Write an enzyme that holds these catalytic residues in place. Structure first.
Site, PDB file in Angstrom:
ATOM      1  N   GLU A 223      -0.568  -6.545   4.667  1.00 54.15           N
ATOM      2  CA  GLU A 223       0.729  -5.883   4.726  1.00 54.15           C
ATOM      3  C   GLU A 223       1.840  -6.860   5.093  1.00 54.15           C
ATOM      4  OE1 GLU A 223       0.620  -1.887   6.775  1.00 54.15           O
ATOM      5  OE2 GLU A 223      -1.460  -2.434   7.037  1.00 54.15           O
TER       6      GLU A 223
ATOM      7  N   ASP B  12      -7.141  -0.931   1.248  1.00 53.11           N
ATOM      8  CA  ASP B  12      -6.403  -1.578   2.318  1.00 53.11           C
ATOM      9  C   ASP B  12      -5.818  -2.884   1.776  1.00 53.11           C
ATOM     10  OD1 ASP B  12      -7.072   0.279   4.302  1.00 53.11           O
ATOM     11  OD2 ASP B  12      -9.015  -0.728   4.600  1.00 53.11           O
ATOM     12  N   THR B  13      -4.521  -3.084   1.830  1.00 54.12           N
ATOM     13  CA  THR B  13      -3.935  -4.350   1.400  1.00 54.12           C
ATOM     14  C   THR B  13      -3.406  -5.135   2.595  1.00 54.12           C
ATOM     15  OG1 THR B  13      -1.695  -3.503   1.130  1.00 54.12           O
ATOM     16  CG2 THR B  13      -3.131  -3.326  -0.737  1.00 54.12           C
TER      17      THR B  13
ATOM     18  N   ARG C 236       2.927  10.950   4.542  1.00 54.37           N
ATOM     19  CA  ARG C 236       2.821  10.303   3.224  1.00 54.37           C
ATOM     20  C   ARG C 236       1.843  10.985   2.277  1.00 54.37           C
ATOM     21  NH1 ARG C 236       1.433   4.185   4.881  1.00 54.37           N
ATOM     22  NH2 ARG C 236      -0.075   5.383   6.192  1.00 54.37           N
TER      23      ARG C 236
ATOM     24  N   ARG D 252       1.125   6.779   0.095  1.00 56.45           N
ATOM     25  CA  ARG D 252       0.108   5.838   0.512  1.00 56.45           C
ATOM     26  C   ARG D 252      -0.919   5.719  -0.621  1.00 56.45           C
ATOM     27  NH1 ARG D 252      -3.533   2.509   1.643  1.00 56.45           N
ATOM     28  NH2 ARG D 252      -4.081   1.967   3.759  1.00 56.45           N
TER      29      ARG D 252
ATOM     30  N   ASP E 211       0.827  -1.200   0.000  1.00 58.51           N
ATOM     31  CA  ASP E 211       0.000   0.000   0.000  1.00 58.51           C
ATOM     32  C   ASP E 211       0.867   1.259   0.000  1.00 58.51           C
ATOM     33  OD1 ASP E 211       1.013   0.236   2.610  1.00 58.51           O
ATOM     34  OD2 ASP E 211      -0.896  -0.116   3.580  1.00 58.51           O
TER      35      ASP E 211
END
Length: 136
Positions: A38, A35-36, A82, A30, A16
């Protein structure tokens, strides 16, 4: 409307997050709205499909001729500093690609940083229907 700006890959960091050279400065980005799983989970560490989601954006951005960043209409940085953006590799949006492959979910959305929300949610419905990866 939104506009795309060029950037240069510095390093893919996770599913992500990617570090880019943007307007001559190294910046961490970001991926907006996703949402991945992680590999660098603050609590969890390395989750299921984390290596795979991270390998996929690495490949996609390392093998691209052109990287572009697209800011949304709201805040452009989060609280960690980010950049918040849609990232494109040769015209293909990395954020949608991850969701289309069942390697990310659509995140909780904060207006007005939600321009491509419906587009992403359609790709997610399809990966769900195809029972891909995370949805298998």
């Amino acid at each position: 409307k939104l506009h795309k700006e060029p950037a240069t890959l510095i390093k893919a960091i996770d599913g992500d997050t990617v570090k880019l050279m943007y307007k001559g400065q190294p910046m961490t980005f970001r991926l907006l709205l996703v949402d991945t799983p992680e590999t660098k989970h603050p609590k969890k560490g390395v989750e299921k499909y984390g290596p795979e989601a991270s390998a996929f954006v690495k490949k996609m951005v390392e093998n691209a001729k052109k990287i572009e960043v697209e800011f949304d209409k709201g805040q452009r940085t989060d609280k960690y500093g980010r950049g918040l953006a849609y990232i494109y590799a040769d015209g293909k949006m990395v954020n949608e690609a991850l969701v289309r492959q069942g390697l990310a979910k659509v995140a909780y959305v904060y207006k007005p940083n939600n321009t491509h929300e419906q587009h992403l949610r359609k790709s997610e419905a399809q990966a769900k229907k195809e029972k891909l990866n995370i949805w298998s």
